[PDB]
Paper text:
Foot-and-mouth disease virus (FMDV), a small nonenveloped single-stranded positive-sense RNA virus (genus Aphthovirus within the family Picornaviridae), is the causative agent of foot-and-mouth disease (FMD). As the major antigen, the virus capsid of FMDV comprises 60 copies each of four virus-encoded proteins, VP1, VP2, VP3 and VP4; VP1 to VP3 form most of the capsid shell, with VP4 lining the interior surface. The final resolution of the cryo-EM reconstruction was estimated by the FSC 0.143 cutoff to be 3.90 Å for the FMDV-OTi-B77 complex, 3.68 Å for the FMDV-OTi-F145 complex, 3.94 Å for the FMDV-OTi-R50 complex and 3.49 Å for the FMDV-AWH-R50 complex.
By contrast, R50 scFv binds to a depression between the 2- and 5-fold axes of FMDV-OTi and FMDV-AWH. R50 binds FMDV-OTi VP1 and VP3 by its heavy chain. The interacting residues in R50 are located in HCDR3, including residues R50-VHR119, R50-VHW120, R50-VHY130, R50-VHN132, R50-VHY138, R50-VHG139, R50-VHR140, R50-VHC141 and R50-VHT142. In addition, the small protruding structure formed by OTi-VP1P94 and OTi-VP1E95 of the VP1 EF-loop makes contact with R50-VHR119, R50-VHC131 and R50-VHN132. One salt bridge between OTi-VP1E95 and R50-VHR119 was inferred because the centroids of the oppositely charged functional groups of the residues were within a 4 Å cutoff and because the Glu carbonyl oxygen atom was within 4 Å from the nitrogen atom of the Arg side chain. Moreover, the side chains of OTi-VP3D173 and OTi-VP3T177 form hydrogen bonds with the side chains of R50-VHY130 and R50-VHY138, respectively. Notably, the R50 footprint on the FMDV capsid does not overlap with identified receptor binding sites, indicating that R50 may not directly compete with the binding of receptor.
Residue numbers in the entry:
A (entry chain 1): 2 to 134, 154 to 203
B (entry chain 4): 15 to 39, 65 to 85
C (entry chain L): 5 to 112
D (entry chain 2): 13 to 218
E (entry chain H): 1 to 145
F (entry chain 3): 1 to 219
Amino acid sequence: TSTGESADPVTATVENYGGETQVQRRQHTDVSFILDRFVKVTPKDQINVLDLMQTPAHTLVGALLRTATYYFADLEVAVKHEGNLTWVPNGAPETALDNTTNPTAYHKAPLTRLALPYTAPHRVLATVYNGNCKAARALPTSFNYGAIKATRVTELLYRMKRAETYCPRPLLAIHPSEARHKQ
Amino acid sequence: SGNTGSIINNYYMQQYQNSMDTQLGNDWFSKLASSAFSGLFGALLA
Amino acid sequence: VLTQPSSVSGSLGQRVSITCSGSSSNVGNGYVSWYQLIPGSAPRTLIYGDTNRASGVPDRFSGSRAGNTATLSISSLQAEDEAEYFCASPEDSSSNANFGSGTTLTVL
Amino acid sequence: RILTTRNGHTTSTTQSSVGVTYGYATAEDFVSGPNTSGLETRVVQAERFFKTHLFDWVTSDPFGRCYQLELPTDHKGVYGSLTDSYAYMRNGWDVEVTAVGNQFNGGCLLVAMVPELCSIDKRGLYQLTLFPHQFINPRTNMTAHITVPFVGVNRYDQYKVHKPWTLVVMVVAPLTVNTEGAPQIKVYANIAPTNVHVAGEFPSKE
Amino acid sequence: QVQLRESGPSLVKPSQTLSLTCTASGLSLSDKAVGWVRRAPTKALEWLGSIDTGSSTGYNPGLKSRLSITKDNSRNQVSLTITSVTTEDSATYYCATVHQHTSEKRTCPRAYRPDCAARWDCPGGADCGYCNFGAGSYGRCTPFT
Amino acid sequence: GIFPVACSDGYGGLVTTDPKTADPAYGKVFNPPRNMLPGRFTNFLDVAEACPTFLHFEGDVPYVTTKTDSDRVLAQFDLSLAAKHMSNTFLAGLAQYYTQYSGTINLHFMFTGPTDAKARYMIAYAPPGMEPPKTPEAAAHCIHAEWDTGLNSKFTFSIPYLSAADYAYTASDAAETTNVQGWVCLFQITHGKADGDALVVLASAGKDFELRLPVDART
């Protein structure tokens, strides 16, 4: 069979050989739905830029998002801060924070949640960038959803809603020394 | 849609809830798979 | 490189000024001093630090600094003012302090 | 199954071919939005192929080595001028790789049109085939005719700082010569822009 | 008022080991370094090297082949050597005293600030972060001088 | 019988943007008829379009002189809303609070010189990437408009908006690496017997210039 070598998807699906195909109901694999889990991200004290790809690669989101170059995530943060945190939209100046005229939230225990409209001015944000010489590099300072200033931010979190991703890029798994990797 | 399906919708309006969207004037990796060639490329005996 | 005048005039009791044109490589990162270099005699401190002076020195001739060019004023011109007034800067292009040839300070 | 492509005034026929593949889309998306105020002007004299030289596939080239090329490759003639005249240009690419073979050599060289790569760590290489690709086995087709429409974070881009498409060639199977096969075939790319657009004009050089 | 004094040979033949000396018996050249310059005849100003008290020399490379200098602290006299002299080299000995020392470091290039890094997990030698997270200028935390 | 409910943690906090409305201390209070106000303005952009504002050129005046020399550049300023040549205008004084703007920016030139003399000015736009031009016929290739000044004087070039992203940034560092929004020009190819006459410019929001993302920063 096959021999097309045209890289156009070909799959027998166990029909080849007298076997019926019990139905495959793929859920827990929509990028609209597997990409909506609060992922703890290392807070950077008082002023940590709030943006995608800050999260370590290993976390579920932090890795199943690098699978896609461009995402449109309508982010919604959840923070656990010690003074009144003051969000700020994209393009706001560094001294922009502490004005309070910006969206802030006073302290309500245990923690305070927010929605963050997609402010960054692009069609869609990009996970990787080219022509610039890694999350801390090879990408424009503009792909972010503001800055979340605080007296102390203890456990920052990012949740993505209605994110449809584009143009997939390869993932990777933990390379085991021996086969049948035991965990 | 995503991980949020509620019968009572949302107390706030759509504009304040999510970003709004625009248009001008479909997906590709769920049509590439659906357009995959299947079966056998030659006459099958037995 | 520094550039400093070599032809100045003046009379007794009236002020003449000296100008020390420099570049970013040398003028910025350090002091601007002036000394009494009587031709054929030794020089001694008269202004160094652009703000402060030592003990036992007269303040008759005021020096200053502003921008990238140094300037001093020669108040109450006298006959002991008949000597060269050198200047310098730290020329960081070779991590050394470029000095200046002093001007013939005549008295009329 | 010969396939005679054509762009502008530059026909490029093949005697062996496998068939055109496509990437991420078949028809390019809309061209004018709020990004440029119709200050867009199409271009129809800048879609002619231009050759280029990638590398020299040789029997000592182990798996993994990939010589990647980044478009537009600073063209000298047409599409070299569109480059220094207009600040923003958007195009979709038509790229065909032609590794000459004696038909007795099998290397399974693979091409891809991966958008915006940086540092595959030799773990993503095994999965590189995810992007559009046709891999050429000299047991079969001596060419591979990809095509991709311009994908980017903006309507239009500046091709001085943000080069979206990089051609990638990977040797899956080191070349294997026997007296019957070329001791080492070279690989060359007919990279050809298509559906160009420009907007805004630089001032002259003087 | 620090004391300074110069002495040297006044009647000299060119193209020899010319060795002037100078004296500084005060603090203006005890913590700070010795001066050696002269004025070009009917020309623009001159330069000759200097040394700090730690024997750290620095000269102009154009004539480095002919310049070398050493220093002393007890007699309050400092050495000098000008070899391979040509007729064009002649002036008066002046400005034995050096009034400066150097410093080169600069930071916060453009709109960046070094202290505001580790906000973007900055990776590499560059330690200067981008201060206002708005339009891109150098991207994120490109290294300064 | 008691209705059950679970109070979410962090669901409710006093966010300083108030989508929710308050509790009323006084149930009933009547204020005098505020209608038919002399002149009302719905949004600031309508006010910005309705009245043109001046720009601040060198020497702290709104007018650009008529230079008489081999140099033909009069005022060549960055297009970002915070440049020195707009620091004065109402449009800048507004966009300073918002962050992202889009669309045209109407520049109004009007010649105020005596009818004794007339001279031609040629605005020119130049998109980013290459250093701004230096002389007429150098910036000619770049989109530009020339105009004499005869019967009537006010001419209104409309600086277009074409940028990589769909929205540009209102506030960005302008110290070094120019700004990326773009350059503009007021090149004067000719001028006959008219040094006294002096140009005055006026900025305004164009047919569409609808800014977003309010952030009350320091001002």
